[PDB]
Amino acid sequence: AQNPNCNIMIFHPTKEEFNDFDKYIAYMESQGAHRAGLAKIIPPKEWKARETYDNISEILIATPLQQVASGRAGVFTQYHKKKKAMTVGEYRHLANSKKYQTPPHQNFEDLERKYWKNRIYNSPIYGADISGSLFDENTKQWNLGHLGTIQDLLEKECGVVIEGVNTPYLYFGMWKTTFAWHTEDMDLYSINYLHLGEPKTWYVVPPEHGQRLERLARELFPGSSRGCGAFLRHKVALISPTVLKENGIPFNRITQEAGEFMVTFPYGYHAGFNHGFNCAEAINFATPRWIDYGKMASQCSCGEARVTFSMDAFVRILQPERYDLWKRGQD
Ligand SMILES: O=C(O)CNC(=O)C(=O)O
Ligand SMILES: [Mg+2]
Ligand code: NI
Ligand SMILES: [Zn+2]
């Protein structure tokens, strides 16, 4: 078995290897990359997502989210308070202000220490989940707005035509902006490109050990667990590496820099934080190997997780027994 310790693997495709996205994902899996839950892909040196980032300041962040924490430094939840709209140029200025800017630090490890020590005492503002793309239309390789759609994959594998669409999302971050422990909707893959700015640190649990993370989360967040049998779908809970290590949960960490892709694999729990002002683009995707994960994915039916239009068909076709109850949660 390849990669039996479930280490995060880093890939360096040539420009030739970067032509066929599906083929490269299947290659990475042949080497065991999915066992980690997360892989890094450094694009060939010849490739670029677009010519410059000089003209992005007028993008609107319609609903910036202030991420307010509750709990203790290593075990906390966050809620998202909606803020007034602002442009990307306005948000960048805010991120660079004395109140929100990255503190002085020695290296990524020192910054990680400072994040876990101090995150809960601040409420950074995240421009998350903005439909759109920063890939030039002429970028032909690994253009996250030109991928094969999940509805087309389900149709190709299973023969059933379904409604829905699959488009990318932009994320504008600042110091301490945080993504809570989660897997993707329907335990899909994700791919994330860091277009510009400061790094993003990731934590990930191997898919084969995901239920260990779930059991610890039920212990650490006991009221939330009673409320919902899949409360990590709410995307609000944080657990630090120190707490994970104290409780024997297998995980790995890596820092993504501008110009790099990350792929998350089906049922790979992940969480992380931004180092400073940045912009990322991400989208879900599927392969044949996903189908079985989609059939077994947990679901929130308490009503909190509230997701996209396109998840309906996935539930309806892959999980017809759950459909009724899940849809009650969505309506
Ligand atoms: O970058 C972020 O805030 C969160 N992104 C992801 O969870 C992802 O790409 O799957
Ligand atoms: Mg603009
Ligand atoms: Ni994710
Ligand atoms: Zn729920």
From Swiss-Prot:
Enzyme class, one word? oxidoreductase
Q: Where is the JmjC domain?
A: 136-302
Modified residues annotated as PolyADP-ribosyl glutamic acid in this record:
E16, E17
The UniProt record gives the binding positions of Zn(2+) as C228, H234, C300, C302
Q: Name one GO molecular function term.
A: histone demethylase activity
Keyword match Oxidoreductase: yes
The cofactor remark states: Binds 1 Fe(2+) ion per subunit.
The subcellular localization recorded is: Nucleus
Which cofactors, if any, are listed as required? Fe(2+)
- State any GO CC term: site of double-strand break
List of residues binding 2-oxoglutarate = Y126, N192, K200, K235
What does the record list as GO biological process? cellular response to ionizing radiation; chromatin remodeling; double-strand break repair via homologous recombination; inflammatory response; positive regulation of chromatin binding; positive regulation of double-strand break repair via nonhomologous end joining; regulation of gene expression; regulation of protein phosphorylation
Modifications after synthesis and translation: Ubiquitinated via 'Lys-63'-linked ubiquitin chains. Deubiquitinated by USP14 with the help of TRIM14 leading to stabilization.
Which UniProt key words apply to this protein? ADP-ribosylation, Chromatin regulator, Dioxygenase, Iron, Metal-binding, Nucleus, Oxidoreductase, Transcription, Transcription regulation, Ubl conjugation, Zinc
Residue stretches spanning the membrane: none
Enzyme Commission number(s) from the entry = 1.14.11.66
The record's catalysed reaction(s) read: N(6),N(6),N(6)-trimethyl-L-lysyl(9)-[histone H3] + 2 2-oxoglutarate + 2 O2 = N(6)-methyl-L-lysyl(9)-[histone H3] + 2 formaldehyde + 2 succinate + 2 CO2
Where is it mostly found?
nucleus
What the record says about family reads:
Belongs to the JHDM3 histone demethylase family.
Identification of the protein by name:
Lysine-specific demethylase 4D
